[PDB]
């Protein structure tokens, strides 16, 4: 790797930065807010008394968290048709308003609650537009709504001047009108009330027993945001380089128990120079520090390929306990492949913090450099040393004065 970094086949003695060491994290632990409520459907569904078919109800579900899965898979519904949108993709979309209409009809009249039908119900009781978007849900309710002797409280309209506009409602009771004639409020030849009543009985063949119906109609409009799907999560860990996501905060690192105290509306903490360094767990609400995961530089110590092919390796500032013989800990990192001796020589290859290396004792060794010999002057208050001879010495000193004059031609380059 050193030969490749230098692009050569002979490396001279030195110390070379060759690559990098970066701990690796695994698994994608998720986190979010405790699974709160799940939209309001209590009344709207489990009501004790439904509404007539000629005056249906109209609940306007609003800003909430709607979970159409508890509906879709409840298996208690005899009919669950979705028109604008297939059912499984409901828990992944957002609209402006949901309306829920409720009523009670016969068993074989559930096929007129659909876009583009005809019949006494869809003509003038409850009409669905031709580009409907929602879903229609229906289930049998014989035991709740049918009573011995006949339940005559569930009426429907059977005469009207003109078919309803979609989602239009008509609770009037003004008498009808047969052939040309007055009939000032009073039954008789060609003329009569406009409302009839299902007489429901418990001994009625299916298709004659009461069914309860709920029509959900999603109507979009425009906004900045609203309800949406439910996010998943896991069980955060600690003391392990990890890849984490805390309800939006995406990062990497080791997570550790904290001892700081946020204010009870603050989610994460930042450092000077603006890096996220603490978070709060959304479920348990405890503060956790996020220290950068291990990492540094890797250096290769070689006596030179013209001497040997042995090598030692320095893992820049990193406890010799998580690197992956001679493992030796230095103030400059963890050294592998050199033995530590107790002697002290002149520095050869500088490691750092007073430590050098050499190819002597062979192999590679570590130690603390030597400042120099030790001379002890015999100083006294009346002693002098005087020289009796001399040497003539001559030394060299080398200095650069110039470098090469180069020219470039911008345009031609």
């Amino acid at each position: 790797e050193t030969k490749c970094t230098l692009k050569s086949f002979t490396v001279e003695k030195g110390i070379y930065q060759t690559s990098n060491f970066r701990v690796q994290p695994t698994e994608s632990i998720v986190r979010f807010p405790n699974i709160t409520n799940l939209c309001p459907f209590g009344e709207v569904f489990n009501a004790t008394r439904f509404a007539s078919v000629y005056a249906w109800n109209r609940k306007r579900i609003s800003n909430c968290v709607a979970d159409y899965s508890v509906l879709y898979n409840s298996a208690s519904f005899s009919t669950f048709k979705c028109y604008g949108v297939s059912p499984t993709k409901l828990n992944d979309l957002c609209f402006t308003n949901v309306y829920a209409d409720s009523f009670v009809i016969r068993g074989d009249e559930v096929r007129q609650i659909a876009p583009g039908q005809t019949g006494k119900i869809a003509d003038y009781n409850y009409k669905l537009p031709d580009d409907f978007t929602g879903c229609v849900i229906a289930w049998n309710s014989n035991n709740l709504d049918s009573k011995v002797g006949g339940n005559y409280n569930y009426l429907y309209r059977l005469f009207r001047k003109s078919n309803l506009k979609p989602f239009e409602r008509d609770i009037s009771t003004e008498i009808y009108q047969a052939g040309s004639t007055p009939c000032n409020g009073v039954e008789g030849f060609n003329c009569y009330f406009p409302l009839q009543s299902y007489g429901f009985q418990p001994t009625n063949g299916v298709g004659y027993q009461p069914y309860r119906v709920v029509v959900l109609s999603f109507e979009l409009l425009h906004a900045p945001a609203t309800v949406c799907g439910p996010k998943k999560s896991t069980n955060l860990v600690k003391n392990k380089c990890v890849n984490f996501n805390f309800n939006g905060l995406t990062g990497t690192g080791v997570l550790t128990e904290s001892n700081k105290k946020f204010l009870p509306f603050q989610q994460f903490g930042r450092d000077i120079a603006d890096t996220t360094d603490a978070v709060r767990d959304p479920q348990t609400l405890e503060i956790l520090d996020i220290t950068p995961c291990s990492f540094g530089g890797v250096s290769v110590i070689t006596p030179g390929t013209n001497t040997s092919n042995q090598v030692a390796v320095l893992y820049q500032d990193v406890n010799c306990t998580e690197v992956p013989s001679n493992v030796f800990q230095t103030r400059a990192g963890c050294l592998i492949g050199a033995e530590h001796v107790n002697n002290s020589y002149e520095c050869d290859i500088p490691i750092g913090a007073g430590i050098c290396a050499s190819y002597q004792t062979q192999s590679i060794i570590a130690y603390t450099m030597s400042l120099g010999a030790e001379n002890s002057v015999a100083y006294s208050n009346n002693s002098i040393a005087i020289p009796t001879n001399f040497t003539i010495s001559v030394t060299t000193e080398i200095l650069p004065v110039s470098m090469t004059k180069t020219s470039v031609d911008c345009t031609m380059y």
Partner: protein
Amino acid sequence: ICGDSTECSNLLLQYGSFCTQLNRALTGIAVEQDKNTQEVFAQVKQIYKTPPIKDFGGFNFSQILPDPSKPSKRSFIEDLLFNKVKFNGLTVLPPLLTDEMIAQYTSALLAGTITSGWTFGAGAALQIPFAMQMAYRFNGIGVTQNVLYENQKLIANQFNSAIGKIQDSLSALGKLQDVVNQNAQALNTLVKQLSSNFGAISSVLNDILSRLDPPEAEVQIDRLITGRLQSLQTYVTQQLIRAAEIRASANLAATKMSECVLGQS
């Protein structure tokens, strides 16, 4: 630049050897900082020691000789001076010499001077009594040497009072604080430059990447890369200009240590 992401590394591979040059530039600077210190302080062959007595003609060097009751073995004035002064790919290497070693070089330079005058700077250390060395130095400034011997006590008292005034004047070092401040402040700007979009949608390499598809995202990631590479070039060029100023200062220090400590100027 990239930082973890992998869509960034292949795009940055297209710029050639811009990052190899910057690492070479920064490594040269770091190797020069150890040679600065070797040239100022390792100006002595042997590690000289003062004798256990302190009979120096009435001169008192106790505030500048090493303190044996310490792990660091610094002197009193060196203790006064030392009480007054992981990230996104950033790392600080330690110096080759500890400052215990530096204090050990300085105390040996001091014991060479107090015991041998200027002879240890030209060869082997030749002991001479301190008053006689002081009298040699009075000759070097053109004063006749009985002026020293007839005023020895007064001259020693004046030295001792002037040495005493230095601690009070200490307990100044703004020239050493400026270097630390300018470097920390230039390193803080490089980190703050990572939260800027440089004209992309955002400044965080994941949200750009998990909200667009590759053809669309590569355009923004190239803008981020261009800005972040410009910031690093600005940083490295200024470190190169600032290290040449520190080198001219360490060169002046080496000449002063040679000419004012190892001789008389």
